[PDB]
Amino acid sequence: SKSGVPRLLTASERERLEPFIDQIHYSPRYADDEYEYRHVMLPKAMLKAIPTDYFNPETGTLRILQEEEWRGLGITQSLGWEMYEVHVPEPHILLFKREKD
Template identity: 50%
Template sequence: MSHKNIYYSDKYYDDKFEYRHVVLPKEIAKLVPKTHLMSETEWRGIGVQQSQGWVHYMIHEPEPHILLFRRPLQDSSAPTQAEQIKNDM
């Protein structure tokens, strides 16, 4: 299974969570269950690679090949808006 075509977004934040989305190629997207959110074991099993703590928290039905992940913020790990803008430049 080719993992090189998996796209990982930059992280983005709100007051409580850190977020990212993962875009899967068609051949891997076929393996995503349509009936439930995936456990860490399941998403790792199809080739998604990211640090611990990420939770598959939502299914966006129009785009099931895009996995939505979040994890709780750890004591001010989110950049301020100014820091985020600076990092995006």
């Protein structure tokens, strides 16, 4: 399997994101025992302006970006945050659950 290499945006690429930056939404933080979480919602129009190599072709979503990469997109947050993704099981794996009594 071959995967994309992390890469910083060029001046022209970054300039293209300007009209969307002020429209980025940051959710309030929520947490569990050992982690804090939050999600960032980009305007849908912004995705068409992001370089294709920033996307995972298999998932259709953005690949896990390193800090320099997401900050480079115009996403601003405090320190410590790391991007993560939900992992969906392959089609041959089924998930079940039942209430405990």
